[PDB]
Design a protein around this ligand. Structure first.
Ligand SMILES: Nc1nc(Nc2ccc(S(N)(=O)=O)cc2)sc1C(=O)Nc1cccc(F)c1
Length: 294
């Protein structure tokens, strides 16, 4: 708070506010997140610790961790812009396919790395995917649902986005697998391509039903065990599955086949980040530099 001079407020994470700040000593510009209170569960520091020791080009680097008076500060390397802003800025023309491919490929490397270190992101969304002028994209905000909790909002009455939530989460599964991050990334990939959220739900049930309306109401054939899930209701409407050709035009067939594997209902059939990296869609992958307006 003192060694840092809050330059500007950057956002409202689901755990606290993020500020752009400068280290009045080292002159470095960083992203500082203030964590939301009555003791600060130490159990989380462990989670945090593993994070600082995590080092990969596609994961935002956690520089310093500061615990002081129910207040937990996380100091991250500062990235230039988030993917939400970039997508909005690119809405008239769309992000060029080679860049979409580059970003997806890089995020999959980020996830493959996290997942191999047994770390789950849990809340991937455009707002927490950060980019720089050099063409990189990194994963920020690693949820920390176990390292903290999922009350009702972000921290001060704010509409949490459910658009990228995997169906198994929406159906009440208490234990998520790495597959939930692949689902979220698939939703994001579709969005980059079409310039419209794939499943823009405004409530958990609306989110679930929009998924059902597009991918078809799941049943025991495509998703063994689904009818026994916590929030599953035999009374759910039975919608037929729509063709991907209609869901994500003009994504070429390789892109659509990859997307379909990222959006399989069954967490166990859903493609892994490692396997996704070997998908033919990335045969011609390159690393373009984006036109960023900072
Ligand atoms: N590292 C890092 N850099 C950031 N910069 C940034 C600059 C401009 C825009 S923008 N709306 O495009 O102009 C957006 C972001 S944000 C962030 C970060 O790490 N957030 C974060 C989020 C949630 C939890 C958490 F712990 C950290």
């Amino acid at each position: 708070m003192e060694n840092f001079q809050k330059v500007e407020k950057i956002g409202e994470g689901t755990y606290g506010v993020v500020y752009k700040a400068r280290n009045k000593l080292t002159g470095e510009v960083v992203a500082l997140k203030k964590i939301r209170t009555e003791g600060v569960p130490s159990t989380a520091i462990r989670e945090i610790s593993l994070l600082k020791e995590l080092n990969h080009p596609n994961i935002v680097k956690l520089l310093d961790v500061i615990h002081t008076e129910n207040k937990l500060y996380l100091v991250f390397e500062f990235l230039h812009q988030d993917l939400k802003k970039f997508m909005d800025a690119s809405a008239l023309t769309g992000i060029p396919l080679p860049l979409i491919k580059s970003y997806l490929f890089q995020l999959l490397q980020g996830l493959a790395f996290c997942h191999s270190h047994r770390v789950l992101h849990r809340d991937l969304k455009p707002q927490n995917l950060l980019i720089n002028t050099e063409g990189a994209i990194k994963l920020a905000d690693f949820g920390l649902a176990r390292a903290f909790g999922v009350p009702v909002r972000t921290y001060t009455h704010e509409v949490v986005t459910l658009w990228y939530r995997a169906p198994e989460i929406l159906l009440g599964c208490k234990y998520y697998s790495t597959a939930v991050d692949i689902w979220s990334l698939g939703c994001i990939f579709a969005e980059m391509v079409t310039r419209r959220a794939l499943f823009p739900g405004d409530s958990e049930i609306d989110q679930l039903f929009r998924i059902f309306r597009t991918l078809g109401t799941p049943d025991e054939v495509v998703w063994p065990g689904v009818t026994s899930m916590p929030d599953y209701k035999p009374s759910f409407p039975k919608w037929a599955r729509q063709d991907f050709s209609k869901v994500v035009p003009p994504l070429d067939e390789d892109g659509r086949s990859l997307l379909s594997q990222m959006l399989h209902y069954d967490p166990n059939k859903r493609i892994s980040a490692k396997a996704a990296l070997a998908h033919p869609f990335f045969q011609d992958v390159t690393k373009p530099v984006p036109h960023l307006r900072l």
